Amino acid sequence: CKEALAKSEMNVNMKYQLPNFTAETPIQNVILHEHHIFLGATNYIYVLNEEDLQKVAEYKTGPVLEHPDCFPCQDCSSKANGVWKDNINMALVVDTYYDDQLISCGSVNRGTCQRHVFPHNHTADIQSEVHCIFSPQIEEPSQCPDCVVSALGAKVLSSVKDRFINFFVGNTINSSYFPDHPLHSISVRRLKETKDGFMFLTDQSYIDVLPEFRDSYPIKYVHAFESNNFIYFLTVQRETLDAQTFHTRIIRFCSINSGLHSYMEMPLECILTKEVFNILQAAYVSKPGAQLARQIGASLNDDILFGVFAQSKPDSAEPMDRSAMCAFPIKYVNDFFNKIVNKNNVRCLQHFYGPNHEHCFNRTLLRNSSGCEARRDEYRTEFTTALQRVDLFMGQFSEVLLTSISTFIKGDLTIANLGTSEGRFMQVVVSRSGPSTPHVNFLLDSHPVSPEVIVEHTLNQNGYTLVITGKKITKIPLNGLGCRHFQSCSQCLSAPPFVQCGWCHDKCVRSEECLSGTWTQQICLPAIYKVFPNSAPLEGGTRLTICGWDFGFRRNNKFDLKKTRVLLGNESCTLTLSESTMNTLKCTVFNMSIIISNGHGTTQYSTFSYVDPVITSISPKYGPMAGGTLLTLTGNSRHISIGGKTCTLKSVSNSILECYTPAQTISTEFAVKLKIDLANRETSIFSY
Amino acid sequence: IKCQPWSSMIPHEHSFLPSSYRGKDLQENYCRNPRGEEGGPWCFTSNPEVRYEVCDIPQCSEVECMTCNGESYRGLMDHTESGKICQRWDHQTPHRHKFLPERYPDKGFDDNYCRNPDGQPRPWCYTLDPHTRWEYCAIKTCAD
Amino acid sequence: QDCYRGNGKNYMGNLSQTRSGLTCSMWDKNMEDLHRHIFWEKLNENYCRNPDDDAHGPWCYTGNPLIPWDYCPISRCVVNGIPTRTNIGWMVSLRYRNKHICGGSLIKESWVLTARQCFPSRDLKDYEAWLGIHDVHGRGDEKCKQVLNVSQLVYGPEGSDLVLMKLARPAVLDDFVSTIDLPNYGCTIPEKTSCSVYGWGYTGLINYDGLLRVAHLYIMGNEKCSQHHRGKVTLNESEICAGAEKIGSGPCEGDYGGPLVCEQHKMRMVLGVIVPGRGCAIPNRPGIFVRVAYYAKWIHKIILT
């Protein structure tokens, strides 16, 4: 009985009491910095302690009067005429190179930013000092040097290259937004060294989609990071200007502040084997564990990008709730950019150059012999052979959408902090070698888990992960949330050793709790829940189902089905391997105890009887030959028939039986023979 | 296109097989049949767009031709007409036959390569299966 | 892949590609040229190991005449100013799209020393050098005005944040325009020395007429600056630290590449180059500059071209 023993499967739902903080509006951005955690939410900025998530201070960029002629940071509060709009924070960074300060960027306020200065004695006091970043562009009023942040969606990255604070910003642009104020799809800004504005180092330091394609060809950036003297961007966009189908793309260029010099774009895809996943939803840069590094061919110190890919609705970006996670060594993809692709896979960039333009009629590529040297006629190169990656969980999550991912290392293993759109958080050890059951699979909140999460790993033994679900920020220690939820011994032993607990004869328990001393994590006793049936004839070979778990000898992952045997008294029942599982057994063989023997231990079950079938009386005795009456039998996987025709079972029991006799064209009596898997002793005759 | 090495997982990552299947002798780059799949020896291409393709490698019946007498033929086939393998002519199990290679040399009584000792139209050999007494060897006729 | 070996003799460079990206040439001709020209004193042929055991590390030769030789890449271990009443010749005003952004120091008739940070563009057609001027706009006078184009730009060692350029044409030297000498290779200025800086920058003024600002300064050891910054700076050997006493005044935007010139024994001599960092004139906080002396010999090696 697979259904009845379902208690063996771990209880998917619990309530976990962890430090949790609530915000009056949903939180968009968050950063941890110097024992204070800064969270940006709609019209709100909170600062929290780590261990408490206590709201020690808050800054109020609440609703603002948006007026068409009001300049961004000037006080137009006296204007009574032109809507009390509200802003959302999408850019929240901390910088310390100039001073220990915070930078935030609003949405409605022309995408203009502000600065908070931390007093040395009390750094959490962010409301003390506020600057605006707004320098009136006297020389070039036509373009914005400080209109830096978009509203639909944007990404901002801070860097210190050549002792210079550089902000790499990618913007999602609408066609109607440019005429009021120009923007740039991808660009680099420098802070004025007096921290009072931005300037454009070069006209080449930005790329904006060509004016006809502002409405079409929408690009949404999902992530971006810095590594190996290069700035990598991860976005989602169409395959072609007229494709109406979407896929993940990445953007590479090194970190020269003069401008985007070697701007090269690359389609990416991860496949199952052969189904591809188009859209990336979350990404994280990290290092691989010793067990994983070899299996991905990556060095232990070499960086790895982990990304979740979900299959989108056809010819659209919205996922069909079919997702997976994949890994990308930065060295492999970098070499792929440098060497793997040939020439004719390279083309000009469509949305900037234009499909019909002079540069990509004929232009050689110094892509191998030269590394992003700042030339003048730099070529923005489009590839076409998308890099194909393989699944790491071989599609074990093929029907669930993933939206938030974090990854850490511990000992030699590496763990991924998975997140769902239904607010369930999983902890999984990632391994191509074998499917690993999530050791933590609870549900946090109704709201989808926010992609932006943070992990801190102090002294390699104490750490945490802050994750955002709607209006909740929650702390989750990586050291093992628990194992009491485990209740199958095989499942308890499948738990990674990083959390120290094991099985002691009743449930997966911590070492020092159960006092019996049976606490073991290498071997335990197999369990049987029930058996059907317990009433069989002495010679009757009846198929018995065995319900329980831990039915086989254990390997690291592959549960061995061959080290199983069955003993009934002294003889052995005919074990059927094709119907032998960890879940149930199917065997085909006076109360005796049935014994199951495994590589670990043996279980004795005391209630199985070779009941001798007894038939006593048949009614009625004499009558007509209609053959439609109720014939009743009684006594102590059964069948019963007369004249080669089975009497349909009108009633069955151990002590009562009743057939509706088949009609036969004869008025005499015959012996009615019971066939309970075998023709047993027959009863007396009944006249027809 | 050159096969992708089975040790390096670029440009295609399904190359854990060197550790997945022991004794299957998938070499550094040579293409094998780790699963015994019906298509044949297939390898990953270093070419990015195509993942794996089956190597074109000929069958064994292509080189082994046949003459009417059959006894003159002494080739490399050691497979019967139903795919069974000829037992060792030096062996005496599972068939206690009559032909002894040292007693009867000069007729190619080698390990398992099919021979025509009794003047059959085709070579035949005793089956490695103890139940099957012997079986014929399927060979296409020669030319020129 | 080299460490603890500042001399090329300890590290036989198994590589033949210079910093720029141009392959090395046959070492026989350049060995002959060295023996004819360099009197420093049979190394491996056509490899980037340097025979001279220079302090900067291994370096190689290039056959192209514009850059005879360059190093191969490998691991190795003013605000509150005073206006000047007299014209200054050491100052070189750089002009980017016909406007000033920074200054530099005149070293030869056709050579000036500037900062790498003041080069947003690598193009030479847009840069323009002005010598001998008292007003940043040029309105003050034009008799000493000297306008020149740009011929060649040569960067310093990796991470030096220093650069030289040789002018399109030579320049006349007189009282109005002056050059500067070099400190010794091991030239160390004594602590508590008083010397000043010249600046063309923001100067912390709501409006400035446009005259160059001279600002005094005092030298102190690296330890005092480390204490003042409270561990926010990890000082290396190549840098010098000089800061004003009890007053917040230092170089800021527009003065980068300017000269830190000081008087040791008889006449004023350059000691450092103005570099961005650490903020704009923090009160009671010293300033950090790059010392020319550590690279002075290298300039010698490059002044031969």
Side-chain angles (χ1 to χ4, degrees), chain A residues 1-398 400-538 540-542 544-564 566-570 572-603 605-620 623-624 626-636 640-644 646-649 651-657 659 661-668 670-672 674 676-680 683-688, chain B residues 1-26 29-70 72-78 80-143, chain C residues 2-3 6-8 10-19 21-25 27-28 30-31 34 37-38 43-75 77-84 86-190 193-222 225-229 231-236 238-244 247-265 268-305:
Chain A
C1 50
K2 281 76 65 178
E3 300 85 5
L5 67 90
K7 74 166 45 63
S8 46
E9 287 77 358
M10 183 278 288
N11 58 6
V12 305
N13 52 353
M14 283 73 74
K15 180 37 181 72
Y16 285 137
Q17 171 50 281
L18 269 298
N20 59 6
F21 172 91
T22 177
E24 288 66 23
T25 79
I27 306 101
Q28 294 77 61
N29 292 39
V30 60
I31 191 64
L32 159 62
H33 164 233
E34 194 269 328
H35 291 339
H36 296 347
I37 294 169
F38 322 109
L39 295 76
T42 309
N43 303 115
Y44 290 164
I45 296 90
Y46 296 166
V47 64
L48 309 198
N49 176 17
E50 308 101 305
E51 306 79 22
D52 303 358
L53 312 188
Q54 57 91 1
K55 173 221 171 302
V56 61
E58 165 273 339
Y59 185 77
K60 181 48 157 42
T61 76
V64 170
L65 269 193
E66 184 275 301
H67 172 280
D69 214 4
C70 179
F71 274 12
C73 287
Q74 65 87 26
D75 45 353
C76 54
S77 45
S78 164
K79 302 296 290 295
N81 49 2
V83 61
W84 261 120
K85 196 89 64 173
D86 59 320
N87 60 359
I88 59 171
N89 172 23
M90 71 295 307
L92 187 153
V93 308
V94 60
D95 61 328
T96 56
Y97 195 42
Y98 276 53
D99 311 278
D100 300 333
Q101 66 181 359
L102 211 60
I103 302 190
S104 76
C105 298
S107 48
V108 57
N109 190 20
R110 201 170 306 261
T112 72
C113 304
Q114 71 176 356
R115 293 169 60 249
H116 294 103
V117 173
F118 301 163
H120 62 281
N121 64 344
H122 189 192
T123 51
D125 177 17
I126 71 164
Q127 201 212 51
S128 195
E129 168 58 60
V130 175
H131 304 77
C132 183
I133 318 163
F134 194 60
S135 44
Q137 51 272 15
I138 306 311
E139 270 82 350
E140 295 84 4
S142 307
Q143 310 78 17
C144 277
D146 312 328
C147 313
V148 291
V149 185
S150 89
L152 307 154
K155 290 294 312 212
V156 62
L157 273 69
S158 168
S159 163
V160 172
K161 178 67 176 177
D162 292 331
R163 300 181 67 181
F164 264 53
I165 278 180
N166 304 1
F167 292 167
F168 317 121
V169 298
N171 310 57
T172 57
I173 53 171
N174 190 328
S175 188
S176 48
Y177 292 8
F178 268 74
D180 177 27
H181 62 315
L183 273 193
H184 290 320
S185 46
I186 302 96
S187 51
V188 177
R189 269 79 164 177
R190 183 178 182 270
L191 177 63
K192 303 300 300 294
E193 204 271 329
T194 52
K195 329 163 204 71
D196 55 330
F198 281 176
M199 62 205 158
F200 281 1
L201 268 187
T202 318
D203 64 351
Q204 277 275 9
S205 49
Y206 50 74
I207 297 169
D208 61 308
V209 166
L210 62 91
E212 197 271 331
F213 280 140
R214 314 252 176 89
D215 213 8
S216 306
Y217 196 46
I219 49 174
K220 280 71 61 183
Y221 315 92
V222 61
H223 187 73
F225 66 94
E226 153 170 38
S227 197
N228 293 318
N229 315 79
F230 282 80
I231 301 306
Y232 310 85
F233 266 62
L234 283 72
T235 176
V236 55
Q237 41 169 346
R238 278 200 218 149
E239 293 280 337
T240 302
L241 294 174
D242 282 308
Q244 292 84 20
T245 184
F246 286 125
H247 72 91
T248 300
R249 203 97 65 102
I250 63 170
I251 306 279
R252 204 185 72 124
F253 54 90
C254 52
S255 86
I256 288 296
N257 67 343
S258 295
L260 282 72
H261 292 308
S262 61
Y263 187 103
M264 52 96 68
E265 61 273 16
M266 186 66 204
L268 270 294
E269 66 207 349
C270 201
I271 66 187
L272 189 155
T273 292
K274 34 187 71 174
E275 179 57 31
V276 309
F277 285 164
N278 292 317
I279 313 314
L280 192 152
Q281 290 75 25
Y284 185 60
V285 60
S286 166
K287 296 214 189 324
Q291 60 90 29
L292 190 48
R294 295 177 293 109
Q295 294 180 357
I296 57 184
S299 297
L300 274 298
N301 65 345
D302 275 21
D303 289 358
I304 307 281
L305 167 59
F306 296 131
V308 295
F309 296 114
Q311 209 193 321
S312 47
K313 300 163 178 139
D315 277 296
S316 44
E318 293 82 4
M320 294 182 286
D321 202 338
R322 293 156 47 64
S323 80
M325 172 285 318
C326 299
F328 299 81
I330 188 165
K331 53 170 187 217
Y332 296 167
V333 302
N334 199 1
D335 187 318
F336 179 109
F337 292 166
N338 304 317
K339 275 79 64 182
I340 293 283
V341 298
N342 65 58
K343 195 267 180 183
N344 64 7
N345 299 123
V346 189
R347 323 176 305 98
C348 61
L349 190 149
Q350 305 312 127
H351 67 246
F352 159 65
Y353 284 130
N356 45 1
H357 195 39
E358 64 182 2
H359 303 100
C360 54
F361 179 75
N362 183 2
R363 188 175 297 278
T364 187
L365 271 300
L366 268 185
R367 83 181 203 83
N368 288 259
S369 308
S370 306
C372 73
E373 293 82 3
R375 316 184 312 97
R376 271 70 146 179
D377 60 300
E378 61 266 17
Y379 189 18
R380 316 316 170 102
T381 62
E382 206 174 5
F383 289 5
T384 47
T385 61
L387 183 148
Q388 315 92 302
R389 185 67 68 182
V390 297
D391 198 309
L392 279 193
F393 299 135
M394 71 285 278
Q396 187 272 350
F397 294 111
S398 85
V400 65
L401 165 60
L402 296 196
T403 176
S404 86
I405 190 167
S406 164
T407 294
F408 62 83
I409 49 165
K410 190 176 290 294
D412 291 331
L413 316 164
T414 175
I415 309 304
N417 310 59
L418 289 191
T420 43
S421 55
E422 59 273 10
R424 311 180 39 72
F425 162 70
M426 283 73 74
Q427 297 210 40
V428 177
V429 63
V430 62
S431 164
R432 175 97 54 66
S433 85
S436 296
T437 289
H439 40 289
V440 179
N441 196 349
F442 70 93
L443 175 142
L444 189 44
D445 185 75
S446 86
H447 194 80
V449 185
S450 194
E452 163 183 2
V453 299
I454 292 167
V455 61
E456 165 58 54
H457 206 313
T458 60
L459 62 88
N460 206 55
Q461 318 292 353
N462 317 121
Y464 45 95
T465 297
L466 61 88
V467 308
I468 285 173
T469 175
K471 320 168 92 203
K472 290 288 187 178
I473 177 65
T474 61
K475 173 184 167 70
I476 300 92
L478 73 165
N479 301 114
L481 295 174
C483 69
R484 177 81 62 243
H485 59 276
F486 297 121
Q487 77 277 26
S488 299
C489 183
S490 44
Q491 188 174 181
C492 181
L493 319 179
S494 51
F498 84 104
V499 55
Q500 181 65 257
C501 80
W503 190 270
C504 65
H505 70 263
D506 59 358
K507 39 158 168 61
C508 192
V509 175
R510 269 284 315 120
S511 199
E512 285 192 80
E513 276 67 3
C514 76
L515 186 62
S516 164
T518 313
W519 184 88
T520 318
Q521 44 196 35
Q522 47 269 57
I523 186 166
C524 70
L525 185 54
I528 283 174
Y529 182 75
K530 328 185 177 80
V531 59
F532 319 101
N534 55 2
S535 89
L538 61 85
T542 301
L544 270 71
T545 48
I546 323 296
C547 313
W549 42 84
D550 210 306
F551 279 145
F553 179 75
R554 199 193 190 292
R555 211 59 66 86
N556 278 127
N557 192 359
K558 175 53 198 163
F559 277 128
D560 313 278
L561 282 181
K562 41 169 280 303
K563 272 146 186 312
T564 77
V566 58
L567 168 66
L568 189 43
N570 295 115
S572 166
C573 170
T574 69
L575 157 67
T576 79
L577 191 149
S578 196
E579 313 89 304
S580 87
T581 70
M582 295 298 102
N583 192 356
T584 45
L585 271 294
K586 164 57 65 173
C587 196
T588 56
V589 72
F590 183 30
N591 180 13
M592 61 295 288
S593 192
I594 181 70
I595 324 296
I596 190 69
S597 77
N598 267 338
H600 296 285
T602 195
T603 305
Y605 172 86
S606 87
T607 61
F608 189 28
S609 47
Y610 277 171
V611 63
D612 293 29
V614 186
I615 188 60
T616 61
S617 66
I618 176 165
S619 87
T629 52
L630 204 48
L631 272 70
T632 68
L633 280 297
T634 183
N636 168 32
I640 176 67
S641 309
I642 186 62
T646 310
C647 60
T648 184
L649 187 150
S651 306
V652 65
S653 162
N654 180 26
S655 304
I656 199 61
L657 320 165
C659 294
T661 177
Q664 60 184 359
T665 74
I666 190 153
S667 165
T668 190
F670 316 103
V672 178
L674 201 63
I676 186 166
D677 170 68
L678 298 152
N680 198 7
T683 182
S684 196
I685 70 168
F686 153 69
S687 167
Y688 265 71
Chain B
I1 298 96
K2 278 314 297 171
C3 287
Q4 170 178 353
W6 309 83
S7 44
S8 164
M9 293 182 286
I10 70 169
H12 309 332
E13 279 73 14
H14 178 50
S15 290
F16 41 92
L17 286 75
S19 185
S20 308
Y21 313 120
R22 303 268 56 62
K24 276 70 178 174
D25 190 359
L26 72 164
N29 199 21
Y30 308 104
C31 78
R32 309 314 172 76
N33 214 322
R35 297 171 103 70
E37 198 276 335
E38 296 85 4
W42 57 267
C43 76
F44 297 143
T45 63
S46 84
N47 200 23
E49 59 274 19
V50 57
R51 196 150 199 263
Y52 61 78
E53 168 197 350
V54 184
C55 319
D56 45 354
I57 187 72
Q59 290 290 347
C60 308
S61 64
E62 57 87 19
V63 69
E64 301 282 318
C65 75
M66 181 45 168
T67 62
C68 69
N69 57 8
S72 300
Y73 158 81
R74 283 165 280 289
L76 301 172
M77 321 275 268
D78 46 355
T80 77
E81 269 173 10
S82 60
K84 309 285 279 294
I85 173 174
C86 310
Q87 90 169 74
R88 305 266 288 183
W89 296 77
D90 299 333
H91 274 162
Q92 206 63 258
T93 51
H95 296 317
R96 204 266 172 273
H97 59 264
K98 195 54 201 273
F99 313 112
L100 296 174
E102 57 276 54
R103 153 56 161 149
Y104 312 110
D106 298 332
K107 291 181 286 296
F109 284 173
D110 51 9
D111 292 330
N112 320 114
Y113 294 164
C114 294
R115 300 298 177 258
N116 194 8
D118 61 335
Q120 292 323 107
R122 285 149 308 127
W124 61 280
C125 58
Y126 299 92
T127 317
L128 182 72
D129 168 40
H131 298 88
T132 314
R133 181 66 178 171
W134 64 268
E135 288 213 288
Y136 269 113
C137 301
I139 314 167
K140 69 173 74 174
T141 63
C142 296
Chain C
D2 185 4
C3 192
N7 304 346
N10 264 5
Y11 191 91
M12 295 298 102
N14 188 350
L15 179 144
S16 88
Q17 174 44 256
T18 190
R19 199 167 45 171
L22 304 184
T23 53
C24 283
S25 196
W27 209 264
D28 49 41
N30 310 82
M31 211 186 267
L34 188 153
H37 189 274
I38 301 312
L43 268 294
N44 171 246
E45 186 70 9
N46 185 20
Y47 266 71
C48 77
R49 51 206 92 188
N50 54 358
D52 291 332
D53 267 0
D54 201 329
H56 292 333
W59 62 258
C60 178
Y61 290 97
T62 44
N64 168 280
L66 272 298
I67 175 65
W69 62 286
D70 207 327
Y71 294 67
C72 84
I74 209 62
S75 88
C77 311
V78 62
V79 190
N80 296 115
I82 303 97
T84 61
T86 301
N87 264 296
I88 290 298
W90 299 271
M91 183 278 288
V92 190
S93 88
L94 188 152
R95 202 145 306 291
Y96 185 60
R97 324 295 163 90
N98 322 297
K99 69 213 165 307
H100 173 279
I101 176 66
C102 291
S105 307
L106 190 54
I107 193 66
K108 307 316 292 171
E109 53 182 328
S110 311
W111 287 92
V112 299
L113 176 50
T114 50
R116 174 215 314 289
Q117 309 306 289
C118 286
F119 289 162
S121 164
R122 309 154 57 65
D123 177 19
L124 305 88
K125 181 54 66 192
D126 48 336
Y127 289 163
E128 152 182 348
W130 277 355
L131 273 299
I133 183 62
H134 212 78
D135 163 73
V136 73
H137 296 89
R139 317 157 294 102
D141 59 345
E142 291 86 3
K143 334 300 164 295
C144 52
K145 172 56 67 181
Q146 187 60 253
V147 55
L148 271 78
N149 290 318
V150 175
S151 60
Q152 175 62 18
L153 260 178
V154 60
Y155 285 103
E158 191 280 299
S160 48
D161 205 7
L162 196 53
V163 66
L164 282 296
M165 62 79 71
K166 66 166 299 311
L167 277 296
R169 323 190 280 201
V172 292
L173 270 295
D174 58 44
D175 61 322
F176 285 169
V177 296
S178 46
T179 51
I180 194 55
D181 64 50
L182 273 299
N184 315 77
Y185 158 77
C187 204
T188 295
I189 183 73
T193 315
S194 166
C195 81
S196 166
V197 292
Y198 296 6
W200 268 129
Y202 181 75
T203 63
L205 290 193
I206 189 66
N207 64 323
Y208 65 99
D209 43 0
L211 280 72
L212 184 144
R213 297 291 184 269
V214 64
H216 307 335
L217 212 54
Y218 313 108
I219 319 299
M220 73 291 291
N222 304 58
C225 313
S226 61
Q227 317 312 309
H228 292 171
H229 273 108
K232 291 294 291 181
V233 292
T234 80
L235 291 84
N236 196 338
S238 75
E239 61 206 83
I240 294 310
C241 179
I247 180 64
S249 195
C252 187
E253 296 98 354
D255 306 321
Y256 306 120
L260 183 40
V261 58
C262 318
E263 196 290 311
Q264 289 184 357
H265 62 92
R268 54 220 175 187
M269 311 165 258
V270 72
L271 268 298
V273 184
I274 285 156
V275 66
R278 305 323 303 180
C280 181
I282 300 93
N284 309 327
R285 183 174 309 297
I288 296 91
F289 313 86
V290 61
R291 154 195 67 193
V292 287
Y294 184 80
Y295 312 85
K297 310 300 307 172
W298 161 78
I299 316 165
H300 297 168
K301 327 291 185 181
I302 196 66
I303 206 64
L304 318 178
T305 292

